[PDB]
Design a protein around this ligand. Structure first.
Ligand SMILES: Cc1cc2nc3c(=O)[nH]c(=O)nc-3n(C[C@H](O)[C@H](O)[C@H](O)COP(=O)(O)OP(=O)(O)OC[C@H]3O[C@@H](n4cnc5c(N)ncnc54)[C@H](O)[C@@H]3O)c2cc1C
Ligand SMILES: Cc1cc2nc3c(=O)[nH]c(=O)nc-3n(C[C@H](O)[C@H](O)[C@H](O)COP(=O)(O)OP(=O)(O)OC[C@H]3O[C@@H](n4cnc5c(N)ncnc54)[C@H](O)[C@@H]3O)c2cc1C
Lengths: 471, 471
């Protein structure tokens, strides 16, 4: 065995973890990062956002190429080699995980391979293949992330029952695939496999996919994917049978078929739960809650002043950008700076086609916390760029506080829609009002000028559309 | 003949004109718009930005499809029908011009077909097929736009010598095409024709394409298109001969070939000049300058208090978004409101592949008006989204004022790069400083988060990069 000592040890090397660690190094702190897997970057880099975007990019080009056929460019069908696609994806990932190790070396952050668990309130041991390493620390940042949900009546040991990780290994292209969960992750994998040939069924208990998004926004999305997928909303999987020739799924609800359906694979994309209970947090005084989260305060302090928690392990939303930013705050706080983590806004994007992107308050949220608001919408059907890009069903929506006229939220549905959120997130943060946005000159013809036009709709000054607001 | 009377007559129905007209109608003014061609929307809609986007979209998918070949999706070569591509383009345009007429009717803006010229300081006649219509007006908005430059030693009567209009009719795919002018318009048509098969030569007097954009930005662009085009910088066309088997072009300068080269067509994309001298502006008191522009003030007043000018006919930049905004100000001013047109920022975008987009001060501009500044760059090679989208050469650049820390400019080179300008234009308008941007949470993985990352580079807080700034 062996024993070492530093100021800061970080547990987990996803976006939250290594962000904190690198920020610690840069603030002149002595840092060690503990990670159980062979590479850094955690879920996001290895089995998450990045691999997903690579496959989604491929799926998009395929679908866009095919659409050109009726305009005079006929590619015919792709000859496809999933093994090479898989190799590309692995190349993209390895490039980035290399950079991460590289930068970890440049910042002299020691990396330790093992599963780490808390010994005492100042001691953490990692049992990695290497040996038993005991770590003595002044400060600890817990960043151990989350994992996919499993149901108990489901045969999760059968290789045809997939979690997201399995979907992204791109083992095969199932002829008929069931997606359990009309959430973001599930809808994205649906998009990938449909491009590659799979027939897609989605089963969702709620009455709309992407439950958190507004109704009008998801209405546009749904009218788009219901052409591609078989959507079974307000419907529920009651039984799952592993048979030789398939997975037999029995459903009940509004769209349930009478008989059990046979599928070649089933992706269970129900959600994710925190890894809070697996660190022996108890043995360092840190309190885990019932659901698995390690609750923290504006400074990312656990109930143990010198032990911090960041990322998915801390609560919704389980998004990468959240983790990074909390990681920075947590490092800065340890390094003495008086900083706090409280963003008024956190963006969310579904990178389906069309994309569904939103930030700030949704109508639902305001309609519930009793905020009085007005919305303004610009439909892409009136957008030169959108028509010319053959993506003319989409809308940009801004949500204003009706007496301050301040922008409190925004949403997009459309191709490359997610790239419009930067402007909206910035405006909310800066306290912009409709006039500020409307009078900013937006390039023509872009999609993002729809943001400014939405504002003009509010101001009742818009000319690119019939204008009922003024006389 | 026939004679009519209204409060406002608008001359020209491009983006500036119909914007002004529609804004006038909405402000309760009696408006007539005069346009010489059969459809509304002017150059931008009919032979400009829209047709260009349509063809550019097609070209992009073609190039993106072809690149998938080395990843496991092999489409092989497209069977192409330029006549159908042409029909598509004409469909996209007709849809939008239909909407224009429609909205013109809904706003009860009378449209008059003819070439209009100024009779007196309150009287304009239009000679259209229809007849002779004399128009008596209280106010006139001049929005007659610009036209492409022609050189005099060039045989412009030869159908193989093209302006942009000719390029966009997509008559044929020349085997060998010469683009005169490494400006935006020229570089974009090069991109279209290369996708459809044309061999491309560009000849540019300056030492870089897109002269106005920063060196470091265009460096990245150039290293990309120099793989596709034959770039002849610091080179000049001295002669052009119409022969049976081609157009023989003689060049001199740094990259000039010894002998004249034979080309199947030559696109002359040197620039555009104002239509200021063709309206008999003289006969209404309006003064035209030497170069063709109708100079105006912060309110878009000509030297004749009740006669306004908007759009290309007024000065650089000759961009559609400028025209629209001025058109609104001009209408509002006429309707009594005390409004002014002075934006601190006007974006520019080349919709090539990769895109080159910039807004606010460039390094050049500041290095000349003696502003002391610092820049921050984020290279896309470090971008997960960019790598995963197979577009990993690109950079986002923010230019800050070094004592206010305010953002004064920004530029992007990369795929869909133009959609990132909205955020940057807004921040400059709002007077944001690097911290405001850096602390705004940007979605991961998007391209636009490179904006926030560039700011973090400036703050010296960035962790997605080796950070030099912090010890
Ligand atoms: C399919 C999919 C798609 C996604 N797409 C997006 C997206 O588009 N945008 C977005 O923002 N987010 C996306 N996410 C969510 C995102 O990946 C997570 O929010 C993010 O990875 C959380 O990072 P983290 O640092 O908190 O945890 P993780 O990335 O989970 O990192 C935790 C690390 O700690 C390690 N670890 C755990 N326990 C121990 C132990 N005790 N000892 C040593 N090491 C340990 C784990 O191995 C892991 O590497 C996606 C997720 C999935 C699954
Ligand atoms: C190939 C190309 C690509 C372009 N791409 C972009 C781009 O991506 N982004 C961008 O912002 N801009 C782009 N532009 C520039 C943009 O098209 C112009 O800035 C815009 O059209 C200017 O609009 P306007 O109303 O000022 O003038 P115009 O669009 O030129 O409209 C003037 C109208 O007045 C009419 N007219 C002129 N004289 C008379 C007469 N005396 N009587 C009656 N009618 C008359 C003309 O027929 C015309 O319809 C592009 C231009 C070209 C050529």
């Amino acid at each position: 065995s062996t024993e070492i000592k530093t100021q800061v040890v970080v547990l987990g090397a996803g976006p939250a973890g290594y962000s904190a660690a690198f920020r610690c190094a840069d603030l002149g702190l002595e840092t060690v990062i503990v990670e159980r897997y062979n590479t850094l970057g955690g879920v996001c880099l290895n089995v998450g956002c990045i691999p997903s975007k690579a496959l989604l990019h491929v799926a998009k080009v395929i679908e866009e190429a095919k659409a050109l056929a009726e305009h005079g460019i006929v590619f015919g069908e792709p000859k496809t080699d999933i093994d090479k696609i898989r190799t590309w994806k692995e190349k993209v990932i390895n490039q980035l995980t290399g950079g991460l190790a590289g930068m970890a070396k440049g910042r002299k952050v020691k990396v330790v391979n093992g599963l780490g668990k808390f010994t005492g309130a100042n001691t953490l041991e990692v049992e990695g293949e290497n040996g038993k390493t005991v770590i003595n620390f002044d400060n600890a940042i817990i960043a151990a992330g989350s994992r996919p949900i499993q149901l108990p009546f489901i045969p999760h040991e059968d290789p045809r029952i997939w979690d997201s990780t399995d979907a992204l290994e791109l083992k095969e292209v199932p002829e008929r695939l069931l997606v359990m969960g009309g959430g973001i992750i599930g809808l994205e994998m649906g998009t990938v496999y449909h491009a590659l040939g799979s027939q897609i069924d989605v089963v969702e208990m709620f009455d709309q996919v992407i439950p958190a998004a507004d109704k009008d926004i998801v209405k546009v999305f749904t009218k788009r994917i219901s052409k591609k997928f078989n959507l079974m909303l307000e419907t529920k999987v009651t039984a799952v049978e592993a048979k030789e020739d398939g997975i037999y799924v029995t459903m009940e609800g509004k769209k349930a078929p009478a008989e059990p359906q046979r599928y070649d694979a089933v992706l269970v994309a129900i959600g994710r739960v925190p890894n809070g209970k697996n660190l022996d947090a108890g043995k360092a005084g840190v309190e885990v809650d019932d659901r698995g989260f390690i609750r923290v305060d504006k400074q990312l302090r656990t109930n143990v002043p010198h032990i911090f928690a960041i990322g998915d392990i801390v609560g919704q939303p389980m998004l990468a950008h959240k983790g990074v930013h909390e990681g920075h705050v947590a490092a800065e706080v340890i390094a003495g700076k008086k900083h706090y983590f409280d963003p008024k806004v956190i963006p969310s994007i579904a990178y389906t086609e069309p994309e569904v992107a939103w930030v700030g308050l949704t109508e639902k949220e305001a309609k519930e916390k009793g905020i009085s608001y007005e919305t303004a919408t610009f439909p892409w059907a009136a957008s030169g760029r959108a028509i010319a890009s053959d993506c003319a069903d989409g809308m940009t929506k801004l949500i204003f506080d009706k007496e301050s006229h301040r922008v409190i939220g925004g949403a997009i549905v459309g191709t490359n829609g997610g790239e419009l959120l930067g402007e909206i997130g910035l405006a909310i943060e800066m306290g912009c009002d409709a006039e500020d946005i409307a009078l900013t000159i937006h390039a023509h013809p872009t999609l993002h000028e729809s943001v400014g036009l939405a504002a003009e709709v509010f101001e009742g000054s818009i000319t690119d559309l019939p204008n009922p607001k003024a006389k």
